Amino acid sequence: VLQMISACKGETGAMVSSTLKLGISILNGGNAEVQQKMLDYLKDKKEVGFFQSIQALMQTCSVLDLNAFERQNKAEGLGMVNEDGTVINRQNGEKVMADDEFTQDLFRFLQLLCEGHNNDFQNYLRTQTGNTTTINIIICTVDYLLRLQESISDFYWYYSGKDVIEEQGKRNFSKAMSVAKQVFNSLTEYIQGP
């Protein structure tokens, strides 16, 4: 599962979106020989590039920015198109946070990569003297976290003027707080280890 990530290095395609579901699938359960399977196999190979794949793959995610929002706020009211047609809402998708499932599955993969409370992985994930390149994933995740809070704080300051809030804006809030649900503990199973 890992070298098909390591040979990718910066492509958010659709095959990554299945080979990380397989990673959720094979890392679910809290198993330890699946961890000791990976550790020696990465340290004695000494091929950096999987960690730059995880460096580049998590910052190409979509944010709650408010210039790509109020245009589809108007485009969602247009239900009936002429010339004997209907709106292809599934083909249009949601243009605001279209990368939700991708970073939903990646953060649970990094969750269950270290849920087993094994601290050589936690010293590994930030400090690699055995390789020549440190990648330091945790401060990248916390810069992701502060990009999230300065996104949704201005999302709140955008509609603080209106009291009663309606449907699709709060559904856009819902599928953002649903990935917040997992990025909020994806750095807690890096720190609850002894």
Binding site: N67, R71, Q72, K74, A75, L78, V81, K95
Partner: peptide, 11 residues
């Protein structure tokens, strides 16, 4: 000939 093909340009 349509506005939704018009306002959905990325910047």
């Amino acid at each position: 000939d349509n506005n939704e093909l018009a306002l959905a340009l990325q910047e």
